[PDB]
Amino acid sequence: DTRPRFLEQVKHECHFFNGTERVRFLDRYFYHQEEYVRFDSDVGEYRAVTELGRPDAEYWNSQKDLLEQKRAAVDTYCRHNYGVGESFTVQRRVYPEVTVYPAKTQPLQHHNLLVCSVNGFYPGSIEVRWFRNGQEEKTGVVSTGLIQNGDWTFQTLVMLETVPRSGEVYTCQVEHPSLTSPLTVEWRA
Amino acid sequence: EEHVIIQAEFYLNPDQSGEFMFDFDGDEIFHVDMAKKETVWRLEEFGRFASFEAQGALANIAVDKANLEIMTKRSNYTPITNVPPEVTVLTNSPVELREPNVLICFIDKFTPPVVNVTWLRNGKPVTTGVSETVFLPREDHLFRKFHYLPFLPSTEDVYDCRVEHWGLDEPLLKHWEFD
Amino acid sequence: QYMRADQAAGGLR
Ligand SMILES: *[C@@H]1O[C@H](CO)[C@@H](O[C@@H]2O[C@H](CO)[C@@H](O)[C@H](O)[C@H]2NC(C)=O)[C@H](O)[C@H]1NC(C)=O
Ligand SMILES: *[C@@H]1O[C@H](CO)[C@@H](O)[C@H](O)[C@H]1NC(C)=O
Ligand SMILES: *[C@@H]1O[C@H](CO)[C@@H](O)[C@H](O)[C@H]1NC(C)=O
């Protein structure tokens, strides 16, 4: 289809600091990709982001009932929804499954790449480390980054560029809020 | 901060498409199906603890529909610029022969939120067992999308995620095959 | 245990 498209977006945002101690509420309006007016609980009124949203800022700021609704959103909307979903969102904990397998950087005879597959964890914050016989190797570590599977689980590959020796023991260490002690998986040649 | 909940909505002309969803730290809590007027929880366990009245969402899309007409006039009918997507194909877990797995097609950084996605195995459209997500919001206000295909790893099967978008001249094919 | 939606503000005109 060649016909031009026209897109409108609205985003009601709730930003939480230390639980529900400090809460920030944003009411943002977008034409295509461009925000043109927003309400911010730090201000208490609508403010035009671009000249396109100035009529809506003055029009909405003249409606005190509307403004009183937006000023109460941190209590009736943000803290409320946080309380409804905190059991399966804020407190969701899934520990990862850790798999180690060798690979090749280039078509070589021997393997020169140790992959540490860390799959299915939540939340996303995680720290993965490589050790060669109990000594951490910070050189030659390449990662795929934090991959979002889109189903409330994350995954990441952390690869070590190394030439394995006989009797060498590598171990991949994983730290995650779902764990109380570091998860380790070892690999030897 | 430490947690962000976003109620994201959009309306699109002339497609007359509307969406309403909740985002938590980048994951979808639920969305409302406009046709059935139902709350759809991303994980079915979510519906056992929380509920949502789906008509409040349609009332918002009705206002977003009216605001879009106002903003289109205000911008002198300035249309949107197509931003083509980045496409990545990957598996849910490390691949083992004849051990079940899931193919994930990640479509990212694109607008408008219209896309045609096709899973191909050996160059043929596959429909069995596929699933997808609604259009998910980005902080740069583009969109992201997920498509899934459970499969059994075999050395004789190759796959492709074919993505069409008005910002693309040719359909984007992202390949996957077993080592 | 219902999640509250926030109202969209109707623009001018
Ligand atoms: C998704 O596929 C549909 C169906 O092929 C596309 O819709 C058609 O586009 C042509 C012009 O290219 C029009 O003449 C038709 O009227 C459209 N509708 C139908 C039902 O055929 C649609 O453009 C594709 N979308 C993307 C993003 O590629
Ligand atoms: C975190 O919340 C507790 C609640 O009692 C509060 O005492 C504490 O000061 C908060 N943290 C900070 C840094 O304010
Ligand atoms: C639309 O056109 C009018 C009339 O020329 C002009 O005053 C206004 O600034 C234009 N706005 C945009 C967004 O182009």
Side-chain angles (χ1 to χ4, degrees), chain A residues 1-21 23-50 52-67 69-96 98-105 107 111-134 136-187 189, chain B residues 1-68 70-179, chain C residues 1-3 5-13:
Chain A
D1 197 323
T2 292
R3 286 176 304 163
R5 262 58 183 181
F6 304 88
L7 177 66
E8 170 84 12
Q9 306 186 59
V10 189
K11 287 180 185 182
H12 316 251
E13 303 185 10
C14 289
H15 301 236
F16 300 94
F17 310 85
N18 160 276
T20 62
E21 207 70 277
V23 180
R24 191 169 190 249
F25 169 76
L26 282 299
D27 195 35
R28 319 174 65 189
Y29 296 77
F30 309 85
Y31 183 68
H32 304 334
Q33 206 186 347
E34 163 217 340
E35 184 178 23
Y36 59 89
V37 69
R38 72 157 63 179
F39 178 93
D40 185 8
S41 56
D42 287 10
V43 172
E45 284 180 352
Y46 282 90
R47 292 291 150 88
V49 177
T50 61
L52 202 63
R54 288 210 244 277
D56 302 326
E58 291 142 349
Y59 179 59
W60 295 342
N61 288 339
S62 74
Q63 308 170 43
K64 297 291 135 173
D65 51 333
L66 175 65
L67 291 194
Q69 291 261 12
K70 300 293 166 173
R71 293 163 184 170
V74 282
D75 288 334
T76 63
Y77 171 70
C78 292
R79 283 185 173 90
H80 172 91
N81 292 346
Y82 188 106
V84 178
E86 57 164 327
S87 71
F88 55 92
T89 65
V90 178
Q91 297 168 353
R92 176 179 170 92
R93 294 289 191 267
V94 177
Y95 62 87
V98 181
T99 286
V100 174
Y101 60 91
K104 299 185 211 175
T105 53
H111 303 276
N112 67 334
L113 208 54
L114 285 180
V115 187
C116 184
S117 193
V118 188
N119 292 82
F121 56 92
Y122 189 92
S125 57
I126 194 167
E127 181 85 56
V128 177
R129 305 191 132 100
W130 276 106
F131 295 79
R132 187 186 300 102
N133 316 307
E136 182 174 357
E137 251 301 330
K138 304 172 149 205
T139 304
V141 155
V142 177
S143 175
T144 192
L146 187 66
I147 307 296
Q148 201 171 33
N149 292 325
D151 64 343
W152 291 83
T153 60
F154 290 90
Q155 64 159 303
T156 180
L157 301 174
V158 180
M159 289 132 288
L160 175 57
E161 330 171 321
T162 186
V163 295
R165 261 100 158 132
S166 62
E168 253 183 352
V169 167
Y170 299 83
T171 174
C172 179
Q173 182 167 278
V174 183
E175 306 181 82
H176 189 254
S178 57
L179 312 168
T180 42
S181 70
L183 206 56
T184 72
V185 175
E186 294 193 344
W187 181 95
Chain B
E1 59 277 79
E2 53 183 87
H3 297 321
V4 178
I5 303 179
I6 299 176
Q7 170 190 322
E9 321 153 19
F10 73 81
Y11 190 86
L12 180 73
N13 282 331
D15 307 80
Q16 307 196 110
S17 310
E19 289 215 1
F20 182 103
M21 59 90 66
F22 262 72
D23 175 302
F24 178 87
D25 295 347
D27 278 281
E28 178 203 334
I29 301 177
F30 72 91
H31 74 269
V32 177
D33 187 277
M34 310 300 166
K36 298 173 183 173
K37 310 151 196 262
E38 300 171 338
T39 302
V40 181
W41 303 95
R42 183 62 177 86
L43 300 185
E44 196 217 57
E45 78 185 56
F46 291 173
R48 308 181 237 276
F49 310 138
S51 297
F52 181 70
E53 169 55 57
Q55 186 93 43
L58 321 161
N60 265 9
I61 269 67
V63 177
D64 301 330
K65 177 182 176 63
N67 287 344
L68 179 56
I70 295 169
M71 302 309 298
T72 307
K73 268 199 290 287
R74 205 178 288 172
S75 73
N76 298 326
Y77 296 83
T78 296
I80 198 177
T81 296
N82 298 322
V83 176
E86 298 172 24
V87 175
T88 304
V89 174
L90 71 161
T91 66
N92 181 277
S93 59
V95 187
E96 318 262 350
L97 288 183
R98 296 171 315 281
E99 275 174 32
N101 210 324
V102 178
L103 276 175
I104 306 174
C105 183
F106 183 44
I107 314 160
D108 196 15
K109 311 198 186 79
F110 66 98
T111 201
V114 193
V115 77
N116 278 335
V117 192
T118 302
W119 283 110
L120 300 170
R121 198 258 307 297
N122 300 326
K124 299 183 180 182
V126 308
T127 320
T128 294
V130 303
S131 59
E132 71 194 49
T133 63
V134 297
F135 294 94
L136 309 172
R138 290 172 45 85
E139 296 182 70
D140 55 18
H141 316 305
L142 300 172
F143 298 93
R144 52 192 170 100
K145 206 169 192 288
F146 290 89
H147 281 248
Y148 306 100
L149 170 62
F151 78 111
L152 264 293
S154 65
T155 62
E156 77 272 353
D157 287 336
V158 303
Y159 292 79
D160 295 284
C161 184
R162 187 185 64 199
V163 172
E164 301 165 30
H165 191 269
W166 297 321
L168 298 169
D169 282 27
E170 292 290 350
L172 199 51
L173 276 76
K174 233 61 183 185
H175 191 74
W176 181 92
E177 75 173 46
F178 183 82
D179 294 22
Chain C
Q1 295 73 39
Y2 274 79
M3 313 199 73
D6 190 50
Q7 168 87 21
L12 183 51
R13 314 311 165 191

